[PDB]
Design a protein around this motif. Structure first.
Motif, mmCIF file in Angstrom:
data_model
loop_
_atom_site.group_PDB
_atom_site.id
_atom_site.type_symbol
_atom_site.label_atom_id
_atom_site.label_comp_id
_atom_site.label_asym_id
_atom_site.label_seq_id
_atom_site.Cartn_x
_atom_site.Cartn_y
_atom_site.Cartn_z
ATOM 1 N N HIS A 232 -16.957 43.052 -15.493
ATOM 2 C CA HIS A 232 -18.220 42.554 -16.034
ATOM 3 C C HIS A 232 -19.381 43.377 -15.441
ATOM 4 N N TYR A 234 -22.409 42.835 -14.139
ATOM 5 C CA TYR A 234 -22.902 42.362 -12.875
ATOM 6 C C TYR A 234 -22.035 42.867 -11.721
ATOM 7 N N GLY A 307 -26.019 35.666 -13.447
ATOM 8 C CA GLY A 307 -25.209 35.180 -14.571
ATOM 9 C C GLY A 307 -25.824 33.958 -15.255
ATOM 10 N N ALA A 308 -26.306 33.032 -14.461
ATOM 11 C CA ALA A 308 -26.963 31.810 -14.933
ATOM 12 C C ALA A 308 -28.037 31.474 -13.924
ATOM 13 N N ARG A 309 -28.872 30.506 -14.277
ATOM 14 C CA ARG A 309 -30.008 30.143 -13.422
ATOM 15 C C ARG A 309 -29.585 29.385 -12.159
ATOM 16 N N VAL A 329 -30.428 37.631 -9.506
ATOM 17 C CA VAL A 329 -30.184 38.729 -10.426
ATOM 18 C C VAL A 329 -30.066 38.172 -11.816
ATOM 19 N N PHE A 330 -31.010 38.541 -12.670
ATOM 20 C CA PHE A 330 -31.043 38.112 -14.057
ATOM 21 C C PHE A 330 -30.942 39.357 -14.922
ATOM 22 N N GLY A 331 -29.714 39.629 -15.356
ATOM 23 C CA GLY A 331 -29.455 40.792 -16.168
ATOM 24 C C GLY A 331 -28.667 40.443 -17.398
ATOM 25 N N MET A 332 -28.411 41.478 -18.195
ATOM 26 C CA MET A 332 -27.632 41.348 -19.425
ATOM 27 C C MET A 332 -26.945 42.659 -19.705
ATOM 28 N N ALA A 333 -25.752 42.555 -20.269
ATOM 29 C CA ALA A 333 -24.926 43.709 -20.616
ATOM 30 C C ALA A 333 -25.662 44.684 -21.561
ATOM 31 N N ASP A 413 -33.265 34.676 -24.742
ATOM 32 C CA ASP A 413 -33.678 33.892 -23.609
ATOM 33 C C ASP A 413 -35.107 33.445 -23.809
ATOM 34 N N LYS A 430 -30.630 31.639 -28.147
ATOM 35 C CA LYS A 430 -29.373 32.119 -28.726
ATOM 36 C C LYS A 430 -28.313 31.027 -28.664
ATOM 37 N N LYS A 439 -20.042 33.349 -20.735
ATOM 38 C CA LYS A 439 -20.733 33.178 -22.002
ATOM 39 C C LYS A 439 -19.775 32.853 -23.136
HETATM 40 N N1 LIG Z 1 -30.165 34.861 -13.145
HETATM 41 C C1 LIG Z 1 -30.106 34.280 -14.375
HETATM 42 N N2 LIG Z 1 -30.744 33.115 -14.625
HETATM 43 C C2 LIG Z 1 -30.635 32.546 -15.901
HETATM 44 N N3 LIG Z 1 -29.853 33.209 -16.862
HETATM 45 C C3 LIG Z 1 -29.237 34.370 -16.546
HETATM 46 C C4 LIG Z 1 -29.354 34.898 -15.328
HETATM 47 N N4 LIG Z 1 -28.590 36.001 -15.307
HETATM 48 C C5 LIG Z 1 -28.051 36.152 -16.491
HETATM 49 N N5 LIG Z 1 -28.449 35.154 -17.261
HETATM 50 C C6 LIG Z 1 -28.076 34.882 -18.674
HETATM 51 O O1 LIG Z 1 -26.987 35.741 -18.967
HETATM 52 C C7 LIG Z 1 -27.311 36.500 -20.159
HETATM 53 C C8 LIG Z 1 -26.660 37.876 -19.976
HETATM 54 O O2 LIG Z 1 -25.253 37.734 -20.086
HETATM 55 S S1 LIG Z 1 -24.278 38.818 -19.554
HETATM 56 O O3 LIG Z 1 -24.096 39.916 -20.579
HETATM 57 O O4 LIG Z 1 -22.923 38.146 -19.291
HETATM 58 N N6 LIG Z 1 -24.835 39.546 -18.158
HETATM 59 C C9 LIG Z 1 -25.184 38.881 -17.031
HETATM 60 O O5 LIG Z 1 -25.226 37.650 -16.955
HETATM 61 C C10 LIG Z 1 -25.598 39.658 -15.918
HETATM 62 C C11 LIG Z 1 -26.059 38.950 -14.814
HETATM 63 C C12 LIG Z 1 -26.484 39.591 -13.660
HETATM 64 C C13 LIG Z 1 -26.437 40.963 -13.556
HETATM 65 C C14 LIG Z 1 -25.989 41.731 -14.605
HETATM 66 C C15 LIG Z 1 -25.602 41.078 -15.752
HETATM 67 N N7 LIG Z 1 -25.146 41.863 -16.668
HETATM 68 O O6 LIG Z 1 -25.944 42.680 -17.270
HETATM 69 O O7 LIG Z 1 -23.917 41.885 -16.824
HETATM 70 C C16 LIG Z 1 -28.835 36.604 -20.099
HETATM 71 O O8 LIG Z 1 -29.388 36.857 -21.377
HETATM 72 C C17 LIG Z 1 -29.167 35.225 -19.667
HETATM 73 O O9 LIG Z 1 -29.115 34.351 -20.800
#
Ligand SMILES: Nc1ncnc2c1ncn2[C@@H]1O[C@H](COS(=O)(=O)NC(=O)c2ccccc2[N+](=O)[O-])[C@@H](O)[C@H]1O
Length: 521
Positions: A232, A234, A307-309, A329-333, A413, A430, A439
């Motif tokens: 994944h 993250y 990953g989540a809040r 860390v609040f990221g997305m793929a 988001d 979403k 997810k």
């Molecule tokens: N820290 C956070 N607080 C609330 N929501 C979060 C969050 N980190 C990720 N998310 C949610 O996760 C979605 C992204 O989903 S994901 O593709 O599986 N990637 C991740 O969650 C992620 C988290 C941390 C670091 C990197 C990634 N990532 O890019 O893989 C975001 O659009 C948010 O809806």
């Protein structure tokens, strides 16, 4: 390999500012090819950078001998094992672009990935239920005839991945795809009925790793526990195992994030950073309360949570009860990763999800019809930048909806931005369940549910859960008596991952036409 390129003026800008360096991702590993320091620890096994790089060359060369060529794709299914990394770099050295499926994924997901990318190569693990025998393989290889080579971990027969890794490459020269072309596919969380692939170029992905490395201050001292699913994003690039490799540190693999497995590994190997999702944090804190010695965690200096809040309550307990620093860390793929910084105030680390890693990450907040909202207001996250994609793979229809005219991606988001520029995640638009960080595209599960003979209408919605944040509940309108276990058995037969089975099922006399907003009320 077709993907949506940045407009030429964005590429040019991103090169002028130093974000895109036009180096292949293989350079993360080959810069350390002469090093005998430890790169990966996996159980009793410890692989140095020299060995790791040689293993990738051997595997790459062996695959080349078996006919795999640059510009082809591969499907890879490996868990938290050293061979995941050997395989990723081996395919990067050949110019083959893989999807890395998670171990947990099953038929429907593998089928979905294989259908989109037409892999010439399948690499998997006989420890996986689907591959302990050869029946599924026969079907998979028949239904996805692009596949010419199958290598398998924990196999003793003709297809033993180890034999390929252990065979010394004779005269091997790497042929990574060009740096502005596709290096690999990431998986989206999922907002639709079929999974979506995110092409990642070398320039864009390497930058996300390199910069995450500056922010997290990773060096050769970094000893990083990778306990969540290793493939994944993250775990891989934020800064993840690849950032560790870049920095010349050490990655310690754990099969899962349980305290039972990880508390000992952290003490034994003197781990100083790791990455978790919120429920794993709670479970850790509760294990300590049930009497695990806090000292097993002494060497820990940085705990990332994403990953989540992460609730503020839960966040504040980290320095208090574990005694390391937190990083949210609040990221997305798809791209954008926001970080709290190591020198941020406690107020920002506990209560926000930080701000973008890049100064030229552009982030604004949109209302229902595409208009920017002033700061402090809650709306849809819109973004573009040097490592955020411009389109999903072969998805013209969905791509039209996912980006505005200017190339901004909507993450689905709901966020607000501080006066200081920090982002707080406030909710979601979403149609996605975030089950402890994992997810679940609701439309995917709903479509599967409607295939049941007895199901007329179906809605999958999240419900609050203290541990997991969200669990899933399937509301069904049915012709006949239907129990939760029948639904779950059925969905499992469709061949989806376990975490996607509804935690709860409820038959109801009616559902509004499905209007989930109405349903929540
Ligand atoms: N820290 C956070 N607080 C609330 N929501 C979060 C969050 N980190 C990720 N998310 C949610 O996760 C979605 C992204 O989903 S994901 O593709 O599986 N990637 C991740 O969650 C992620 C988290 C941390 C670091 C990197 C990634 N990532 O890019 O893989 C975001 O659009 C948010 O809806």
């Amino acid at each position: 390999i077709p993907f949506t390129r940045w407009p030429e003026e964005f590429a040019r800008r991103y090169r002028e500012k130093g974000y895109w360096q036009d180096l292949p991702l293989t350079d993360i590993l080959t810069r350390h090819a002469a090093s005998d320091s430890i790169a990966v620890i996996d159980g009793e096994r410890q692989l140095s950078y020299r060995e790791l790089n040689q293993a990738a060359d051997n595997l790459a060369c062996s695959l080349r001998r078996q006919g795999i060529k640059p510009g082809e794709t591969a499907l890879v299914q490996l868990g938290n094992v050293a061979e995941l990394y050997i395989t990723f770099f081996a395919l990067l050295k050949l110019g083959v672009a893989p999807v890395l499926a998670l171990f947990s994924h099953q038929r429907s997901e593998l089928n979905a990935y294989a259908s989109q990318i037409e892999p010439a190569l399948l690499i998997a693990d006989r420890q996986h239920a689907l591959f302990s025998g050869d029946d599924f393989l026969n079907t998979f290889v028949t239904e996805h005839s692009s596949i010419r080579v199958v290598q398998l971990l924990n196999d003793s027969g003709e297809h033993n991945l180890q034999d390929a890794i252990n065979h010394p490459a004779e005269d091997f020269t790497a042929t990574p795809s060009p740096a502005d072309e596709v290096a690999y596919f990431q998986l989206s969380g999922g907002t639709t009925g079929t999974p979506k692939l995110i092409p990642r170029t070398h320039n864009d992905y390497y930058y996300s790793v390199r910069r995450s490395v500056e922010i997290c201050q990773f060096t050769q001292q970094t000893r990083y526990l990778c306990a969540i699913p290793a493939a994944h994003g993250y775990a891989m690039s934020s800064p993840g195992s690849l950032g560790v490799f870049l920095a010349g540190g050490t990655v310690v693999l754990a099969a899962d994030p349980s305290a039972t497995l990880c508390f000992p590994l952290i003490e034994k190997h003197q781990v100083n950073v790791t990455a978790l999702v919120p429920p794993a944090v709670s479970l850790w804190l509760q294990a300590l309360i049930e009497g695990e010695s806090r000292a097993q965690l002494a060497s820990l200096k940085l705990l990332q949570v994403g990953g989540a809040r992460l609730s503020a309550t839960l966040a504040a307990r980290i320095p208090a009860e574990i005694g390391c620093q937190l990083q949210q860390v609040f990221g997305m793929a798809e791209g954008l990763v926001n970080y709290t910084r190591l020198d941020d105030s406690a107020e920002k680390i506990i209560h926000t999800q930080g701000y973008p890693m890049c100064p030229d990450d552009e982030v604004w907040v949109a209302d229902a019809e595409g208009n920017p909202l002033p700061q402090g207001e809650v709306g849809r996250l819109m973004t573009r930048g040097p490592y955020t994609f411009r389109g999903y793979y072969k998805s013209p229809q969905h791509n039209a909806s996912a980006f505005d005219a200017n190339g901004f991606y909507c993450s689905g988001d709901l966020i607000s931005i501080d006066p200081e520029g920090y982002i707080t995640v406030q909710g979601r638009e979403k149609d996605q369940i975030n089950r402890g960080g994992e997810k679940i595209a609701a439309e995917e599960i709903e479509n599967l549910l409607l295939r049941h003979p007895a199901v007329i209408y179906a809605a999958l919605v999240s419900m609050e859960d203290e541990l997991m944040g969200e669990k899933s509940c399937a509301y069904l309108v049915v012709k006949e008596p239907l129990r939760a276990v029948q639904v779950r058995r059925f969905l499992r037969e469709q061949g989806i991952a376990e975490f996607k089975l509804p935690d709860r099922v409820e038959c109801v006399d009616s559902l509004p036409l499905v209007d989930k907003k109405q349903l929540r009320q």
